[PDB]
Ligand binder design. Structure first.
Ligand SMILES: [Zn+2]
Ligand SMILES: [Zn+2]
Ligand SMILES: [Zn+2]
Ligand SMILES: [Zn+2]
Length: 101
């Protein structure tokens, strides 16, 4: 398992980061994410990497990439991303894992 634990967790044992805020430039778990991002909506003026909006059917799409769906995974963020994100550079130096021939 290559999942990063919530570095900003003080539960003992601590939790694991499943989400990441881009505007914060840090990866945290849902718990912390709850405190850091207080109720306000529609999204507390904070963006993320492939969030979980009211829209739910099968999978999830990127922030602004409908033509390209998420088919990659980022470790530093512990979330799912799209190859187009890793190409542009948003996740170039990021340690991800993709399929292999
Ligand atoms: Zn946490
Ligand atoms: Zn944030
Ligand atoms: Zn990343
Ligand atoms: Zn993307």
């Amino acid at each position: 398992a290559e999942k990063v634990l919530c570095q900003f967790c003080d539960q003992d044992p601590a939790q694991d980061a499943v989400k990441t805020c881009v505007t914060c430039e840090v990866s945290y778990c849902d718990e912390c994410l709850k405190a850091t991002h207080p109720n306000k909506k529609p999204f507390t003026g904070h963006r993320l990497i492939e969030p979980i909006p009211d829209s739910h059917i099968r999978g999830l799409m990127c922030l602004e990439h409908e033509d390209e769906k998420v088919n990659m995974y980022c470790v530093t963020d512990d979330q799912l991303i799209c190859a187009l994100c890793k190409l542009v550079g948003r996740h170039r130096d990021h340690q991800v894992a993709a399929l292999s021939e």
